[PDB]
Protein backbone atom coordinates (compact mmCIF):
# COMPACT_ATOMS: atom_id res chain seq x y z
CA UNK A 1 0.00 0.00 0.00
CA UNK A 2 1.19 3.40 -0.91
CA UNK A 3 2.52 5.30 2.33
CA UNK A 4 4.12 8.66 2.85
CA UNK A 5 6.13 9.14 6.19
CA UNK A 6 7.26 12.51 7.59
CA UNK A 7 9.80 13.80 9.60
CA UNK A 8 9.63 14.47 13.26
CA UNK A 9 8.14 17.86 14.57
CA UNK A 10 10.48 20.51 15.18
CA UNK A 11 11.88 23.84 17.17
CA UNK A 12 13.89 26.63 15.05
CA UNK A 13 15.06 29.93 16.00
CA UNK A 14 14.20 33.09 14.12
CA UNK A 15 16.40 33.19 10.91
CA UNK A 16 17.12 29.71 10.87
CA UNK A 17 16.28 26.71 8.74
CA UNK A 18 14.56 23.55 8.91
CA UNK A 19 14.10 20.63 6.75
CA UNK A 20 11.29 18.37 6.68
CA UNK A 21 11.28 14.84 4.99
CA UNK A 22 8.90 12.99 3.08
CA UNK A 23 9.11 9.43 2.78
CA UNK A 24 7.50 7.13 -0.05
CA UNK A 25 6.62 3.28 -0.01
CA UNK A 26 4.38 0.99 -2.07
CA UNK A 27 4.79 3.13 -5.60
CA UNK A 28 7.32 4.12 -8.02
CA UNK A 29 8.54 7.06 -6.68
CA UNK A 30 9.69 8.85 -9.86
CA UNK A 31 6.31 8.42 -11.99
CA UNK A 32 4.26 11.03 -9.21
CA UNK A 33 4.39 14.46 -8.05
CA UNK A 34 5.32 15.44 -4.12
CA UNK A 35 3.24 17.90 -3.17
CA UNK A 36 4.09 20.51 -0.43
CA UNK A 37 0.79 22.07 1.80
CA UNK A 38 1.12 24.62 4.58
CA UNK A 39 -1.96 24.51 7.63
CA UNK A 40 -1.65 27.29 10.23
CA UNK A 41 -5.12 27.54 12.36
CA UNK A 42 -7.21 30.22 10.48
CA UNK A 43 -5.46 30.13 7.12
CA UNK A 44 -6.84 26.31 5.82
CA UNK A 45 -4.18 24.57 3.43
CA UNK A 46 -1.95 26.49 1.34
CA UNK A 47 0.05 25.29 -1.66
CA UNK A 48 3.57 25.53 -1.34
CA UNK A 49 4.87 23.56 -4.43
CA UNK A 50 5.72 20.08 -6.04
CA UNK A 51 8.37 18.47 -7.70
CA UNK A 52 8.58 15.13 -9.90
CA UNK A 53 11.18 13.20 -7.96
CA UNK A 54 14.24 12.27 -10.49
CA UNK A 55 13.41 15.02 -13.08
CA UNK A 56 14.02 17.95 -11.04
CA UNK A 57 10.80 19.68 -11.90
CA UNK A 58 9.43 22.19 -9.28
CA UNK A 59 6.23 24.50 -9.16
CA UNK A 60 6.35 27.21 -6.70
CA UNK A 61 3.21 29.05 -5.36
CA UNK A 62 4.88 32.83 -5.89
CA UNK A 63 4.55 33.51 -2.29
CA UNK A 64 7.22 30.89 -1.32
CA UNK A 65 9.86 31.69 -3.75
CA UNK A 66 12.63 32.41 -1.32
CA UNK A 67 11.72 30.32 1.12
CA UNK A 68 10.81 26.68 -0.04
CA UNK A 69 13.51 24.18 -1.58
CA UNK A 70 12.45 21.03 -2.85
CA UNK A 71 14.76 18.34 -3.38
CA UNK A 72 14.17 14.33 -3.78
CA UNK A 73 16.00 11.58 -3.75
CA UNK A 74 14.92 8.69 -6.19
CA UNK A 75 17.71 6.05 -4.21
CA UNK A 76 16.48 6.60 -0.66
CA UNK A 77 12.50 7.32 -1.77
CA UNK A 78 12.31 10.40 0.38
CA UNK A 79 11.68 14.02 -0.85
CA UNK A 80 12.74 16.82 0.87
CA UNK A 81 11.84 20.53 2.05
CA UNK A 82 13.66 23.06 3.37
CA UNK A 83 12.43 26.37 4.48
CA UNK A 84 14.63 28.97 4.96
CA UNK A 85 14.76 32.65 7.20
CA UNK A 86 12.43 31.25 9.38
CA UNK A 87 9.73 33.80 11.26
CA UNK A 88 6.54 32.96 13.48
CA UNK A 89 4.66 33.39 10.27
CA UNK A 90 6.20 29.68 9.37
CA UNK A 91 4.81 27.95 12.34
CA UNK A 92 3.01 25.75 10.99
CA UNK A 93 1.87 21.98 10.05
CA UNK A 94 3.71 20.95 6.82
CA UNK A 95 2.04 18.43 4.70
CA UNK A 96 3.86 15.51 1.34
CA UNK A 97 1.55 14.25 -0.24
CA UNK A 98 1.12 12.41 -3.64
CA UNK A 99 -0.92 13.11 -7.37
CA UNK A 100 -3.54 10.96 -7.77
CA UNK A 101 -3.12 7.44 -10.18
CA UNK A 102 -5.50 8.82 -12.71
CA UNK A 103 -3.72 12.28 -13.35
CA UNK A 104 -4.84 15.65 -12.22
CA UNK A 105 -6.79 13.80 -9.72
CA UNK A 106 -6.54 15.18 -5.84
CA UNK A 107 -3.89 14.15 -3.80
CA UNK A 108 -4.95 10.76 -2.73
CA UNK A 109 -2.13 10.21 -0.27
CA UNK A 110 -1.27 12.55 2.34
CA UNK A 111 2.29 12.44 4.71
CA UNK A 112 0.70 12.41 8.51
CA UNK A 113 1.95 16.03 8.66
CA UNK A 114 5.27 17.68 10.37
CA UNK A 115 4.61 20.60 12.86
CA UNK A 116 7.48 23.30 13.08
CA UNK A 117 7.52 25.59 15.87
CA UNK A 118 9.52 28.91 15.05
CA UNK A 119 10.47 29.82 18.62
CA UNK A 120 13.54 31.56 20.52
CA UNK A 121 12.42 29.64 23.92
CA UNK A 122 14.22 26.30 24.67
CA UNK A 123 12.88 22.67 24.67
CA UNK A 124 11.54 21.31 27.43
CA UNK A 125 10.00 18.23 28.94
CA UNK A 126 6.63 18.09 30.82
CA UNK A 127 5.54 16.49 33.75
CA UNK A 128 3.18 14.05 33.99
CA UNK A 129 0.74 14.02 37.16
CA UNK A 130 -1.98 11.10 37.32
CA UNK A 131 -6.06 12.79 37.70
CA UNK A 132 -6.57 9.94 40.05
CA UNK A 133 -10.17 8.28 39.73
CA UNK A 134 -12.17 8.72 42.97
CA UNK A 135 -15.68 9.30 44.04
CA UNK A 136 -15.74 12.33 43.14
CA UNK A 137 -14.81 11.65 39.45
CA UNK A 138 -17.42 8.90 39.01
CA UNK A 139 -21.15 9.04 38.01
CA UNK A 140 -23.48 6.13 37.86
CA UNK A 141 -20.67 3.84 38.04
CA UNK A 142 -18.50 5.35 35.34
CA UNK A 143 -15.31 6.66 36.84
CA UNK A 144 -12.99 9.70 35.43
CA UNK A 145 -9.40 9.15 35.24
CA UNK A 146 -6.57 10.85 33.68
CA UNK A 147 -2.94 12.67 33.18
CA UNK A 148 -1.94 16.24 33.06
CA UNK A 149 0.95 16.90 30.85
CA UNK A 150 2.09 20.27 32.54
CA UNK A 151 5.10 22.59 31.33
CA UNK A 152 6.57 21.47 28.09
CA UNK A 153 7.59 23.40 25.03
CA UNK A 154 7.09 22.85 22.18
CA UNK A 155 4.35 21.51 20.91
CA UNK A 156 3.40 18.35 20.32
CA UNK A 157 3.04 15.78 22.61
CA UNK A 158 1.24 12.42 22.58
CA UNK A 159 -1.17 10.30 24.95
CA UNK A 160 -2.17 6.84 24.72
CA UNK A 161 -3.76 4.77 26.97
CA UNK A 162 -2.56 0.80 28.37
CA UNK A 163 -0.22 1.21 24.60
CA UNK A 164 -2.78 1.45 22.32
CA UNK A 165 -5.44 -0.97 24.32
CA UNK A 166 -7.72 1.65 25.59
CA UNK A 167 -9.11 4.09 22.68
CA UNK A 168 -12.70 3.91 23.59
CA UNK A 169 -14.27 7.27 26.00
CA UNK A 170 -10.46 9.13 25.37
CA UNK A 171 -10.36 12.67 25.50
CA UNK A 172 -7.24 14.13 24.92
CA UNK A 173 -7.64 18.41 25.04
CA UNK A 174 -6.13 20.68 22.83
CA UNK A 175 -2.68 22.38 24.60
CA UNK A 176 -3.20 25.57 25.98
CA UNK A 177 -0.44 28.20 26.43
CA UNK A 178 0.28 28.72 30.10
CA UNK A 179 1.40 32.52 31.00
CA UNK A 180 4.71 31.04 31.47
CA UNK A 181 4.70 30.49 28.11
CA UNK A 182 4.74 26.63 28.12
CA UNK A 183 2.24 24.63 27.23
CA UNK A 184 -0.24 22.14 29.31
CA UNK A 185 -3.01 19.53 28.64
CA UNK A 186 -4.75 16.50 29.91
CA UNK A 187 -6.00 13.10 28.37
CA UNK A 188 -8.81 11.68 30.07
CA UNK A 189 -10.88 8.48 29.95
CA UNK A 190 -14.46 7.09 31.16
CA UNK A 191 -14.52 3.27 32.61
CA UNK A 192 -16.40 1.24 34.95
CA UNK A 193 -15.85 2.59 38.47
CA UNK A 194 -16.24 -1.13 39.37
CA UNK A 195 -12.10 -1.89 37.62
CA UNK A 196 -10.65 0.03 39.15
CA UNK A 197 -9.44 -2.25 42.08
CA UNK A 198 -8.59 -4.92 38.89
CA UNK A 199 -7.89 -3.09 35.92
CA UNK A 200 -4.33 -1.49 35.76
CA UNK A 201 -4.47 2.05 33.59
CA UNK A 202 -1.15 3.71 32.28
CA UNK A 203 -1.07 6.72 30.75
CA UNK A 204 2.14 6.71 27.67
CA UNK A 205 3.06 9.96 26.93
CA UNK A 206 5.58 11.01 24.68
CA UNK A 207 7.04 14.77 23.97
CA UNK A 208 9.68 14.11 20.91
CA UNK A 209 11.42 17.02 20.74
CA UNK A 210 12.82 16.80 24.43
CA UNK A 211 12.87 13.12 23.66
CA UNK A 212 10.93 12.37 27.18
CA UNK A 213 8.74 9.39 27.39
CA UNK A 214 6.37 8.51 30.65
CA UNK A 215 4.20 5.89 31.43
CA UNK A 216 2.64 7.02 34.37
CA UNK A 217 0.13 4.23 36.00
CA UNK A 218 -2.87 5.97 37.68
CA UNK A 219 -3.63 4.77 40.80
CA UNK A 220 -7.44 4.90 42.13
CA UNK A 221 -8.14 6.80 45.58
CA UNK A 222 -10.47 6.57 48.27
CA UNK A 223 -12.67 9.47 49.60
CA UNK A 224 -13.69 10.30 53.17
CA UNK A 225 -14.76 13.23 55.15
CA UNK A 226 -12.05 14.62 58.13
CA UNK A 227 -14.02 12.91 61.05
CA UNK A 228 -13.14 11.11 64.41
CA UNK A 229 -14.75 7.63 64.71
CA UNK B 1 -3.46 32.86 -10.10
CA UNK B 2 -6.94 30.78 -10.10
CA UNK B 3 -8.72 32.05 -6.99
CA UNK B 4 -11.14 29.72 -5.37
CA UNK B 5 -14.08 30.86 -3.05
CA UNK B 6 -15.82 28.12 -0.82
CA UNK B 7 -18.81 29.29 0.64
CA UNK B 8 -20.64 29.34 3.53
CA UNK B 9 -18.32 29.70 5.95
CA UNK B 10 -19.60 27.36 8.29
CA UNK B 11 -23.26 25.18 8.38
CA UNK B 12 -24.34 23.42 11.17
CA UNK B 13 -26.93 20.22 10.05
CA UNK B 14 -28.48 17.25 12.01
CA UNK B 15 -27.52 14.12 11.10
CA UNK B 16 -29.72 12.18 8.51
CA UNK B 17 -29.88 15.68 6.51
CA UNK B 18 -28.67 16.63 3.08
CA UNK B 19 -25.78 19.66 2.73
CA UNK B 20 -24.90 21.61 -0.28
CA UNK B 21 -21.47 23.69 -0.09
CA UNK B 22 -20.52 25.91 -3.55
CA UNK B 23 -17.04 26.56 -4.78
CA UNK B 24 -16.24 29.23 -7.37
CA UNK B 25 -13.29 29.82 -9.47
CA UNK B 26 -11.99 32.48 -10.37
CA UNK B 27 -11.49 30.83 -13.96
CA UNK B 28 -12.88 28.22 -15.90
CA UNK B 29 -11.67 24.97 -14.65
CA UNK B 30 -13.27 23.08 -17.67
CA UNK B 31 -10.83 22.16 -19.74
CA UNK B 32 -12.47 22.34 -23.62
CA UNK B 33 -9.60 20.12 -24.39
CA UNK B 34 -11.35 16.76 -23.15
CA UNK B 35 -14.30 18.54 -21.44
CA UNK B 36 -13.50 17.55 -18.09
CA UNK B 37 -13.33 19.73 -15.12
CA UNK B 38 -10.22 19.79 -12.72
CA UNK B 39 -11.60 20.83 -9.56
CA UNK B 40 -11.12 18.53 -6.59
CA UNK B 41 -12.57 17.90 -3.15
CA UNK B 42 -11.24 16.91 0.12
CA UNK B 43 -12.63 16.12 3.96
CA UNK B 44 -10.33 16.90 7.09
CA UNK B 45 -11.92 15.42 9.80
CA UNK B 46 -10.29 17.06 13.38
CA UNK B 47 -6.29 15.58 13.85
CA UNK B 48 -6.15 14.27 10.77
CA UNK B 49 -4.24 15.13 7.08
CA UNK B 50 -7.24 16.21 4.52
CA UNK B 51 -8.60 12.87 2.48
CA UNK B 52 -9.23 13.16 -1.16
CA UNK B 53 -13.18 12.55 -1.85
CA UNK B 54 -13.62 14.09 -5.38
CA UNK B 55 -11.69 14.53 -8.59
CA UNK B 56 -12.89 16.02 -12.14
CA UNK B 57 -15.17 17.54 -10.29
CA UNK B 58 -18.22 14.31 -10.05
CA UNK B 59 -15.87 11.29 -9.64
CA UNK B 60 -15.84 9.67 -6.34
CA UNK B 61 -12.28 8.16 -5.04
CA UNK B 62 -12.53 4.52 -4.65
CA UNK B 63 -14.28 3.74 -0.78
CA UNK B 64 -16.16 7.16 -1.01
CA UNK B 65 -19.74 6.76 0.01
CA UNK B 66 -22.28 6.83 -2.62
CA UNK B 67 -23.65 9.64 -0.86
CA UNK B 68 -20.70 12.24 -1.47
CA UNK B 69 -21.99 13.89 -4.99
CA UNK B 70 -19.84 16.39 -6.49
CA UNK B 71 -21.57 18.39 -9.57
CA UNK B 72 -21.03 21.95 -11.60
CA UNK B 73 -18.98 22.96 -14.79
CA UNK B 74 -16.46 25.89 -15.32
CA UNK B 75 -16.59 27.85 -12.33
CA UNK B 76 -19.49 26.57 -10.53
CA UNK B 77 -19.52 23.85 -7.96
CA UNK B 78 -21.00 21.86 -5.55
CA UNK B 79 -20.12 19.17 -3.23
CA UNK B 80 -23.65 17.56 -1.86
CA UNK B 81 -23.43 15.17 1.28
CA UNK B 82 -26.95 13.15 1.61
CA UNK B 83 -27.55 11.44 5.02
CA UNK B 84 -25.07 13.43 6.91
CA UNK B 85 -23.14 11.46 9.52
CA UNK B 86 -21.90 12.26 12.82
CA UNK B 87 -18.55 11.25 11.42
CA UNK B 88 -18.94 13.49 8.35
CA UNK B 89 -17.86 16.31 10.95
CA UNK B 90 -15.14 18.02 8.50
CA UNK B 91 -13.29 21.18 7.06
CA UNK B 92 -14.11 20.50 3.04
CA UNK B 93 -11.80 22.06 0.70
CA UNK B 94 -12.20 22.46 -2.93
CA UNK B 95 -8.84 22.70 -5.40
CA UNK B 96 -8.15 24.04 -8.70
CA UNK B 97 -6.16 21.04 -10.06
CA UNK B 98 -6.17 22.76 -13.50
CA UNK B 99 -3.25 24.94 -14.02
CA UNK B 100 -0.22 25.88 -11.62
CA UNK B 101 0.07 27.57 -8.91
CA UNK B 102 -2.38 24.80 -7.89
CA UNK B 103 -4.80 26.75 -5.43
CA UNK B 104 -7.46 25.75 -2.41
CA UNK B 105 -10.63 27.53 -1.21
CA UNK B 106 -10.66 28.52 2.50
CA UNK B 107 -12.46 25.69 3.65
CA UNK B 108 -16.22 25.08 4.65
CA UNK B 109 -17.05 23.74 8.07
CA UNK B 110 -19.70 21.58 8.85
CA UNK B 111 -21.09 20.76 12.06
CA UNK B 112 -23.34 18.75 14.15
CA UNK B 113 -26.30 19.56 15.81
CA UNK B 114 -27.99 17.48 17.45
CA UNK B 115 -30.75 17.24 21.14
CA UNK B 116 -29.22 18.49 24.47
CA UNK B 117 -26.52 16.90 26.02
CA UNK B 118 -26.28 17.56 29.81
CA UNK B 119 -22.44 17.29 30.71
CA UNK B 120 -21.01 15.15 33.35
CA UNK B 121 -19.10 16.55 35.71
CA UNK B 122 -15.95 15.40 37.34
CA UNK B 123 -13.46 16.86 39.90
CA UNK B 124 -9.79 16.02 40.58
CA UNK B 125 -7.58 16.83 43.51
CA UNK B 126 -3.83 17.55 42.92
CA UNK B 127 -1.82 14.88 42.86
CA UNK B 128 0.75 14.09 45.93
CA UNK B 129 3.41 14.34 43.10
CA UNK B 130 2.69 17.78 42.39
CA UNK B 131 2.79 18.87 45.59
CA UNK B 132 5.74 17.49 46.44
CA UNK B 133 7.09 20.25 43.35
CA UNK B 134 5.32 22.69 45.31
CA UNK B 135 1.69 23.40 43.07
CA UNK B 136 -1.07 22.27 43.13
CA UNK B 137 -3.65 21.94 40.28
CA UNK B 138 -7.01 20.79 40.25
CA UNK B 139 -9.21 19.63 37.29
CA UNK B 140 -12.69 20.10 36.40
CA UNK B 141 -14.06 17.75 33.43
CA UNK B 142 -17.37 18.57 31.87
CA UNK B 143 -17.91 15.52 29.60
CA UNK B 144 -20.09 15.09 26.81
CA UNK B 145 -22.14 17.54 26.08
CA UNK B 146 -24.47 19.43 23.84
CA UNK B 147 -24.20 22.30 22.77
CA UNK B 148 -20.83 23.82 22.79
CA UNK B 149 -22.05 26.92 25.22
CA UNK B 150 -20.86 26.20 28.56
CA UNK B 151 -19.74 28.62 32.01
CA UNK B 152 -16.93 26.93 34.59
CA UNK B 153 -16.54 28.85 37.54
CA UNK B 154 -14.12 27.89 40.57
CA UNK B 155 -15.17 28.38 43.91
CA UNK B 156 -12.31 28.35 46.74
CA UNK B 157 -13.95 28.33 50.12
CA UNK B 158 -17.40 29.99 48.74
CA UNK B 159 -14.80 32.72 46.92
CA UNK B 160 -15.29 33.37 42.83
CA UNK B 161 -11.54 32.92 41.04
CA UNK B 162 -10.25 34.85 38.49
CA UNK B 163 -7.24 34.55 36.24
CA UNK B 164 -5.85 31.51 37.69
CA UNK B 165 -7.78 28.80 36.08
CA UNK B 166 -7.14 28.45 31.86
CA UNK B 167 -9.73 25.95 29.75
CA UNK B 168 -9.64 24.02 26.84
CA UNK B 169 -12.42 22.49 24.84
CA UNK B 170 -12.66 19.50 22.00
CA UNK B 171 -13.95 19.55 18.70
CA UNK B 172 -17.18 17.68 17.98
CA UNK B 173 -17.26 14.15 18.63
CA UNK B 174 -16.94 11.94 15.74
CA UNK B 175 -19.50 9.45 16.87
CA UNK B 176 -22.06 11.70 19.21
CA UNK B 177 -20.91 15.24 18.47
CA UNK B 178 -20.74 16.66 21.69
CA UNK B 179 -18.17 18.48 23.55
CA UNK B 180 -15.64 18.01 26.18
CA UNK B 181 -14.25 20.32 28.49
CA UNK B 182 -11.57 20.78 30.85
CA UNK B 183 -11.14 23.93 33.46
CA UNK B 184 -7.91 23.81 35.54
CA UNK B 185 -6.83 25.84 38.43
CA UNK B 186 -3.81 26.30 39.67
CA UNK B 187 -2.14 27.32 42.64
CA UNK B 188 1.16 27.27 44.82
CA UNK B 189 1.30 24.14 47.17
CA UNK B 190 0.98 27.11 50.43
CA UNK B 191 -2.00 29.07 48.91
CA UNK B 192 -3.74 25.64 48.13
CA UNK B 193 -3.03 24.74 52.00
CA UNK B 194 -4.86 27.96 53.25
CA UNK B 195 -8.06 26.71 51.84
CA UNK B 196 -10.81 23.77 52.73
CA UNK B 197 -13.25 23.80 49.93
CA UNK B 198 -12.68 23.84 45.90
CA UNK B 199 -15.53 23.51 43.61
CA UNK B 200 -16.63 23.35 40.31
CA UNK B 201 -19.46 25.51 39.75
CA UNK B 202 -21.04 24.45 36.14
CA UNK B 203 -23.86 26.19 33.80
CA UNK B 204 -25.18 24.67 30.68
CA UNK B 205 -28.74 24.21 28.80
CA UNK B 206 -28.90 20.39 29.64
CA UNK B 207 -28.76 21.43 33.33
CA UNK B 208 -32.33 22.88 35.19
CA UNK B 209 -29.34 24.74 37.57
CA UNK B 210 -26.16 25.40 37.85
CA UNK B 211 -24.41 22.15 39.39
CA UNK B 212 -21.42 22.04 41.45
CA UNK B 213 -18.68 19.47 42.14
CA UNK B 214 -16.75 19.79 45.18
CA UNK B 215 -14.35 18.40 47.49
CA UNK B 216 -12.35 19.29 51.01
CA UNK B 217 -8.63 19.33 50.88
CA UNK B 218 -7.47 15.53 51.90
CA UNK B 219 -10.47 14.26 51.33
CA UNK B 220 -9.21 12.39 48.52
CA1 LIG C 1 14.93 17.97 9.89
Known amino acids: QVHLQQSGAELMKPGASVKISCKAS????????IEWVKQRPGHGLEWIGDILPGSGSTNYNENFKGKATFTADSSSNTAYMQLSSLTSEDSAVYYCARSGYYGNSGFAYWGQGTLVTVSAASTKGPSVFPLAPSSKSTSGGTAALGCLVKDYFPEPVTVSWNSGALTSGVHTFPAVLQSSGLYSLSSVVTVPSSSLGTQTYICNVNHKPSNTKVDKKVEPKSCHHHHHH | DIVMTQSPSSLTVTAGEKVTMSCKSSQSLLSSGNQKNYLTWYQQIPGQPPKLLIYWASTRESGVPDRFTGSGSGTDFTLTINSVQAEDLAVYYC?????????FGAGTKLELKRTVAAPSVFIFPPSDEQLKSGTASVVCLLNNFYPREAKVQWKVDNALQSGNSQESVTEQDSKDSTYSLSSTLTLSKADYEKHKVYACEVTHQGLSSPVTKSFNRGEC
Open chain 2, 95 to 103: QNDYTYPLT
Open chain 1, 26 to 33: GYTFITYW
